[PDB]
């Protein structure tokens, strides 16, 4: 297959870097999303004044 | 090393660059079609101009 | 060869990604679509 980046696409190291970057982005998003979902789903609303 | 390239675009393109370029233009057209569909759906949801 | 095809590919790809992120942020944080809160 044609490529403009032979040292990244063809090698094992380049494919590892691509997969690692995608996984890092996914994990960074997922952790924050789940933390704030839990926080806003269990924390009760403040009691209105008398 | 550039026999597949048309004679008009020889001084700018290579053999592999021509194939990568064709892939790029196909991707751009597909993305434009998807974008049109997405915009139609988002307008059907809630118009942004009133 | 003044223009390299690789350079133009990289530059256009990065510009498109940045514009997509910017437009998403601008549209979502507006009176309409209200961060999807509705």
């Amino acid at each position: 297959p044609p490529t403009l980046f032979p040292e990244i696409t063809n090698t094992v190291r380049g494919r590892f870097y691509i997969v690692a970057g995608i996984i890092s982005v996914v994990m960074a998003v997922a952790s924050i999303a789940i933390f704030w979902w839990i926080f806003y789903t269990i924390t009760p609303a403040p009691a209105p004044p008398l | 090393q550039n026999d597949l390239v048309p004679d008009q675009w020889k001084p700018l393109f290579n053999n592999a660059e021509w194939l990568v370029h064709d892939i790029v233009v196909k991707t751009i057209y597909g993305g434009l079609i998807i974008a049109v569909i997405a915009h139609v759906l988002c307008w059907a949801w809630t118009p942004w101009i009133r | 060869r003044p223009f390299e095809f690789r350079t133009s590919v990289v530059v256009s790809t990065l510009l498109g990604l940045v514009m997509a992120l910017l437009i998403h942020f601008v549209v979502l944080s507006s009176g309409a679509f209200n961060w999807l809160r509705a």
Binding site: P1, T9, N10, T11, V12, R15, I18, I22 | - | -
Partner: peptide, 30 residues
Amino acid sequence: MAPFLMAFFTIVLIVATLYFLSMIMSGKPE
């Protein structure tokens, strides 16, 4: 209507990423 659109865009993103990864990682690596 919002959850349907969010699902549609998520599906599009996932399919596009998988397709381009399959196109990138095709052939015997060196």
